[PDB]
Amino acid sequence: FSRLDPPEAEVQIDRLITGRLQSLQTYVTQQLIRAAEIRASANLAATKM
Amino acid sequence: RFASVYAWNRKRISNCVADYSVLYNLAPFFTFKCYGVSPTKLNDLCFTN
Amino acid sequence: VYADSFVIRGDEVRQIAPGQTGNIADYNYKLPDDFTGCVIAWNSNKLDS
Numbered sequence: 001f002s003r004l005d006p007p008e009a010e011v012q013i014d015r016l017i018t019g020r021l022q023s024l025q026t027y028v029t030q031q032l033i034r035a036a037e038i039r040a041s042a043n044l045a046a047t048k049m
Numbered sequence: 050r051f052a053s054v055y056a057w058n059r060k061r062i063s064n065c066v067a068d069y070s071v072l073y074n075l076a077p078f079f080t081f082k083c084y085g086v087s088p089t090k091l092n093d094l095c096f097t098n
Numbered sequence: 099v100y101a102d103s104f105v106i107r108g109d110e111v112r113q114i115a116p117g118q119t120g121n122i123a124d125y126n127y128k129l130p131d132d133f134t135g136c137v138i139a140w141n142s143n144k145l146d147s
Contacts, residue, residue, distance in 0.1 A: 003094065005087035005117070006131070073120075077109070089119065 063098065067091075102127075105146065111139050 001009055052058040069091050072078060081088055106114075106122060113120045114137055116129040123129075 003086045003090055005089060008087070089117075 061098070067096070105142075106139075108141065114139070 004012065069088070086094070104127065110120055110122050112118075113123050114127075114129065116131050116133050
């Protein structure tokens with residue numbers, strides 16, 4: 001924002017906002033699959049106890 | 050005098066305070082394309098070399 | 099539809115565009131950054147001179 005005028009500055013930050021959202025989308029999705037993997041172990045642990 | 054195309058000059062400017070309004074006031078300077086920084090921000094940065 | 103008519107000197111005729119800086123824009127007539135319209139400027143040296 002310091003080096004670029006207002007219109008182009010958005011063009012550039014669009015790449016970062018979509019880029020960083022893609023980083024969080026991947027992070028959350030990996031957590032969802034891991035959470036289900038832990039749950040199947042928790043249900044097995046509850047079954048054995 | 051300005052140099053020729055095939056042997057272009059290179060002057061190193063350092064250790065001073067940069068004001069760009071003198072450029073805009075004197076002569077039209079029709080083409081002022083900039084490739085890494087917007088001209089209106091040139092007054093709010095600091096340059097290495 | 100609103101029409102604004104005036105006469106400037108031909109040196110700064112291109113400072114009408116929003117986002118520019120200068121005496122005429124900052125002190126006489128400035129347009130918003132989100133201007134939605136058109137501008138028509140011509141030379142009338144045959145009449146006013």
